[PDB]
Ligand code: BEF
């Protein structure tokens with residue numbers, strides 16, 4: 196039962212040694228916008244050298260796997276394999292492929308409220324998109340992602356497809372909003388998903404943290420022992436909650452969305468699923484254990 | 486009076502109407518569907534007036550300011566109504582905001598509005614200054630979410646920016662989630678936009694329209710209404726009927742609109758008593774057989 200203590204000194208050396216791997220959230224953890232978190236690449240390198248597995252799990256649905264891989268390299272994280280990178284975009288594509296196969300054939304298409312990266316992730320899995328060239332097949336699912344082209348007419352069209360009860364509704368994540376480097380905020384997929392759900396009268400299947408699905412998607416590709424895995428993230432209600440649900444050890448870093456006091460407030464309120472085991476000022480602080 | 490969803494006809498209809506001082510009518514799906522009146526609706530209103538029963542009208546429709554809504558009634562054949570009898574969520578939003586945003590002269594700021602020109606006009610008639618109107622946009626002191634056919638990701642973003650300030654109010658006209666169109670398709674309702682704005686801003690909106698009691702308050706500032714002796718007549722269980730229950734009125738579901746008898750009956754069998762109408766009719770025309 197999580198106590199939100201500062202991970203330093205001996206405990207930190209013990210926690211890292213016991214670890215098989217570290218699951219890292221990306222935004223607010225490795226970088227903020229185009230500014231990397233100092234020590235972050237050096238941390239990853241030392242982790243690898245110490246033979247501790249690293250994986251990356253992000254609710255960001257803007258970047259397909261190849262562009263996310265480029266971003267890591269560009270910002271200075273070398274030696275990563277694309278296979279280590281999980282976004283809600285990737286896992287939505289895999290969930291939709293799973294739900295849409297069958298003994299039946301001639302499936303259908305996905306209507307996507309989202310950007311080019313999310314679309315590209317679905318095409319890479321072999322799904323067809325409403326609005327691509329050629330045949331208009333039956334729309335069999337609506338996917339809601341981070342959609343800067345969101346509009347009333349696109350909301351209306353989503354709901355029309357959802358009048359068919361067999362048409363699925365999937366959302367990449369419910370993150371409600373995100374910080375920008377200028378201090379302003381941008382609405383998150385959760386706000387778009389809420390509009391689509393309310394207008395269509397449906398409940399969405401949510402793929403991203405804190406949904407366990409994000410973890411299944413990962414364990415299909417790697418063996419992960421939740422007991423010996425650290426889940427590291429900056430957001431209490433997505434990363435920490437996810438970590439608790441998966442039975443992992445949880446580390447809040449303070450470089451991102453949540454504050455140490457928000458965590459303490461959950462603790463005093465006895466909401467244990469939202470309380471991290473440990474916190475650090477920065478993921479750079481983890482290095483003193485290697 | 487625990488609702489049993491009974492068909493209002495015969496003696497029950499004569500009794501209920503006889504005890505009533507007045508009838509509150511929801512408008513869409515009740516007096517009309519689109520540009521098509523419900524047959525008998527104009528005659529009903531006339532006969533109600535002759536019988537000395539007061540009528541008032543509530544709508545969650547935020548598209549027409551009160552003058553145009555009044556012109557609509559007249560054009561479709563409803564005679565004898567005065568504009569002051571018409572309460573829309575637009576009107577009541579303008580009043581809530583006028584109440585909450587008066588203060589010293591210099592304090593007065595602006596309302597950032599997600600909605601159409603009807604709603605805009607309703608707020609200006611109440612003396613409110615609007616972001617996006619000509620000249621200086623003063624401090625935004627409230628965000629209003631209404632039915633917004635021009636809703637967009639950037640305007641959602643701009644609303645949230647205003648809402649970062651905890652003292653900026655968030656008001657929604659209503660939470661109706663979607664509405665039927667004449668071709669059988671649907672348009673998203675304010676409730677869906679409001680949900681997006683509330684989620685992205687981390688705020689709870691003050692809701693003005695039915696089933697919020699605020700709409701009833703907005704009405705009782707202008708007219709004496711005894712809820713015990715008033716019928717609330719509507720086509721939507723989750724908005725009109727619930728509203729009637731919260732205000733302590735006898736509730737009548739009419740079937741010419743959004744909800745079905747079977748939806749009402751399922752609420753009954755589930756014990757969701759606040760979503761069960763006391764009575765129902767196929768059409769509000771049926772009410773006429775209870776008047777002499
Ligand atoms: F990249 Be994480 F979801 F902030």
Ligand code: BEF
Nearest residue numbers: 511512513544545
């Ligand atoms: F006019 Be009601 F709000 F349908």
Ligand SMILES: [Mg+2]
Nearest residue numbers: 220222223429
């Ligand atoms: Mg993050």
Ligand SMILES: [Mg+2]
Nearest residue numbers: 511513514720
């Ligand atoms: Mg109605």
